[PDB]
Nucleic acid binder design. Structure first.
Ligand code: CA
Ligand code: CA
Ligand code: CA
Ligand code: CA
Ligand code: ZN
Ligand code: ZN
Ligand code: ZN
Ligand code: ZN
Lengths: 244, 63, 47, 244, 63, 231, 231, 47
DNA sequence: ACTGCTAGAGATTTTCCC
DNA sequence: GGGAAAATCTCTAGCA
DNA sequence: ACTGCTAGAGATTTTCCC
DNA sequence: GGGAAAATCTCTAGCA
């Protein structure tokens, strides 16, 4: 039916009909009409209907600046627990960002920060602070704010809590720190029924305890399975495959 | 002296995810923890999750 | 060998085709006329 | 545990903690903590996680103005079929809207139009045209554009098709009518594998044929079931209940 | 003279929806058509859909 | 299944009903009934519109009539220009399945712009519609005092003609007639697509009329058989 | 299940281990092991911080020390003002579970603004931390040439003290010590919430220690029994 | 008798409580201080 | 007393073909 | 009863 | 060579309580 | 084995 291919291409060059229209009008199988619409450069206008998944390691944080009442709030989240650090900074500058990040890295075990491509985070000042503190800098894809979705969800939740307790504070600094208190310790629910403050110390104490426990386990089990990771009665995990 | 530590590392719960399913799969049993991967046992199924896709907690509602 | 038709920095138009260099879980690294770009997989179509 | 209720209300007045935090901290059952958080006016900040459903009757259309290249495109959709009427109007005025609507009602059996609260559609001019043609005017909830979701989806699809064939036309009027041609007749898929032009004549011919057929059926079956609508061997539908 | 018309009105297909499920349920059998409601038979289940929630077509892929 | 086939063959050779009557009466698939009506030797237009220009009050009204139904579309155009005629024709082709237009060989109908529009939309040009023009002009005179402009009176007249003037055999308006005619044409096109899809198959050497879920209807030497396939 | 209970009771009356050792050794729920350690008569602070002000280079550094772990938080504040002290205290209470602060009764620590901040955050005020202040001041002197400002040197010193100075028994830093201490306090609070939830139930008249899926652990007259409940 | 806390015309703040007059499939008609309003059900919470 | 949807891309499940 | 094709399901942008 | 998520509201399903 | 409570599932706004 190559006459159908020729007339279907000659009609798709005008009307840009999809594969169902060319498969119904010119007696084409769906593979051939899909090839005709896929060979057109003007018809590739839609991406994959999926979503990625952010890095929820126990050492990676996510930072973002938001704006409220004409002031700048620099917010960081522990993406494995939802623990929120936040400050009101006098300017959206790399100096204040590097100060906030050095103070946060001194407070908590920060291994990685995942920011956008804001000038605050892209600067040489935040780049020397993360070199000194030992923090790795991951930057998201530009104008893709979903790559830092944890910190934008926490910006939404933090602005909601700030709006709830705004009349209890006379300045915005007090309201931001009150909202940080309320989110970290006065709101529960999640992967353990915890607040974010309980969840971050569970994440970090679990990281320390499992690291030391696996270090003590690994120096005893020294079998070579045809390196033994975990022996069970139904399967055996080696390195990483699960042999029956 | 070793099986005590193995059961202790199996007392930890793992909340993991797959490559294209955006929902958080429930609390698995931590079998092994590495630098890049985490071997879990969910629903009598031994999986190897990446380390970047797992939240490991000792649930303090163990009381 | 793949063709990648992608969506770019705040532009509604769709560019391409480009050579696919690397395909990840949620992003692709491609090369459109000697320009190495990292696009999300929601903003790219691979053929 | 009314001491728990008193301290939980006294703490929720400060921190606005959710029901899980008050149920974990003050030994409350979930019903009581849910009552404490539901009696607070400051904590009702989220609506129902659902969506409504538009009226997909065979006689209702949906109209909207969009803007492209500095010009105004008045678009109407048959929401039961996706059939698109569109024009480029010289101004977003009720005179041009009433002309477009009177012309559309003369072309197709328009029983109802569902517009937003744009001044074009809210005017007295469009109100005399729909009175003369016999069209009912439904207006959506203001600043809720999802109540006219069919016409906004068709505005998105129409702008995409206009962008596909923009270099085949020298004016935007020709490109809009070419896109109307392509959407109505050169793109298939949907509830019957049809294009929108096949689907609207299926909808309307089915409406006419089923109306005449039920009119001929109803004047014969005149039974009173303890009014018969449809008798089967397993059930009987009366009026409207399905009696076994 | 009447059962011919009843089978003719049963040759029409209905695509309907429920109150909170946003997906379009598949082609049912039109049993009765009124001014405000439409009685259908989907999966040997007789339902009464509102008229505003139904798209009734005679599928011309009946050939 | 063969019982309805032999009843339809005898009924066609005694009465000569078409494939729609044999498909409604004897419960056959339409490919089988069309092969029954095509086996006989005794029994060996919905897309044609017609365009004219009517002058009222100095203004020009372009009028397209569906010649099978009498359905009408009129527009007060600013001039008898090939641009305005091609714009009207591209609008009309986008609204309805227009396959052929019949014009009156004017300076605007034989323009290169209208030829380009008919080439793009796929319309063929050919060079009692005056009854439709007279009824439209008398309805305009009946409705002119209800409008301020002439452009919003011809649309009122098109509404009155297409949906408020019933007549003919069954007392249907022009809108019901055109949707029945276009639905019949869509059934004809779907049957032709179903015939063309199986016209290359051969069943062992016989034709393939209908491939059911349990039966296969073939035609070996003008004899429709039902047996329970190479391309 | 009763076997581990009698082993834990004998092991506690011969060795006097706490409920954590009896819950890890004999696989008991912690309510049962705590009732074992509470039945005995021989065996009848993670939220306390301490705040001081240290003057360097004319500027004032407010220093809070977790007195159970030695974890430190320092901020160069613009003045010894109750506003700045209450802001530091609300920040610290939002970061960590602060229950008690111990101050040095200054004009800024006994202010009404700090009292309002401690009332809002729920902190109680009380009126070898100088060892922590001396170690912080010597780390600042060790790190002053790596910073341009003093405010970004005290954060470097807090980083070095909390995560780069290990010592004590197990060689842990102050950050690991404070996360272990706060995790132990959270386990203590969850056990107290589990005890308070079942302290009103009575089982037929005996206490309710653990309600399993097949067993019910009661205590009738200092005798932990396992039998397979009114409030 | 119900309380309705709703979201209004292009305002991020949530108003209420109001008397519920009518509850539909996707919208509610309520009365907030002698003002009959029609709100979607995604922009309203009924207690 | 009113109301998200639509079309495309990819994955998954069901049906047809011997 | 495997493999391939078709039908169905899942999910996303973008229009407001 | 990197990546939507989070918390709340309501519906549905599973588990506990005799 | 019904009823109630709790756990789980589904879905949406809003942050970019
Ligand atoms: Ca940003
Ligand atoms: Ca609008
Ligand atoms: Ca719009
Ligand atoms: Ca942001
Ligand atoms: Zn194309
Ligand atoms: Zn509240
Ligand atoms: Zn014949
Ligand atoms: Zn003791």
């Amino acid at each position: 039916f190559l006459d159908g291919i020729d007339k279907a291409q000659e009609e798709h060059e005008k009307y840009h009909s999809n594969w169902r229209a060319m498969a119904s009008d010119f007696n084409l199988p769906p593979v051939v009409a899909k090839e005709i619409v896929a060979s057109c450069d003007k018809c590739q206008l839609k991406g994959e209907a999926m979503h990625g998944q952010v890095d929820c390691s126990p050492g990676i944080w996510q930072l973002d600046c938001t704006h409220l009442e004409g002031k700048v709030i620099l917010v960081a989240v522990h993406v494995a627990s939802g623990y929120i650090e936040a400050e009101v900074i006098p300017a959206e500058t790399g100096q204040e960002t590097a100060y906030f990040l050095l103070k946060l890295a001194g407070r908590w075990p920060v291994k990685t920060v995942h920011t956008d491509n804001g000038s605050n985070f892209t600067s040489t000042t935040v780049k020397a602070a993360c070199w000194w503190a030992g923090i790795k800098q991951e930057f998201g894809i530009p104008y893709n704010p979903q790559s830092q979705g944890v910190i934008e969800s926490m910006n939404k939740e933090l602005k909601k809590i700030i709006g709830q307790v705004r009349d209890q504070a006379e300045h915005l600094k007090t309201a931001v720190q009150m909202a940080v208190f309320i989110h970290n310790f006065k709101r529960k629910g999640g992967i353990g029924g915890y607040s974010a403050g309980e969840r971050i110390v569970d994440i970090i104490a679990t990281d320390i305890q499992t690291k030391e426990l696996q270090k003590q386990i690994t120096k005893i089990q020294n079998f070579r399975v045809y390196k033994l990771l975990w022996k069970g009665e139904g399967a055996v995990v080696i390195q990483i495959k699960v042999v029956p | 002296e070793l099986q005590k530590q193995i059961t202790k590392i199996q007392n930890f719960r793992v909340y993991y995810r797959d490559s294209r399913d955006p929902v958080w799969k429930g609390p698995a049993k931590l079998l092994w923890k590495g630098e890049g991967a985490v071997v879990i046992q969910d629903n009598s199924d031994i999986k190897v999750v990446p380390r970047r896709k797992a939240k490991i907690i000792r649930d303090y509602g163990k009381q | 060998n793949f063709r990648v038709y992608y969506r770019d920095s705040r532009d509604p138009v769709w560019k391409g085709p480009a050579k696919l260099l690397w395909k990840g879980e949620g992003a692709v690294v491609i090369q459109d006329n000697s320009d190495i770009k990292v696009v999300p997989r929601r903003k790219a179509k691979i053929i």
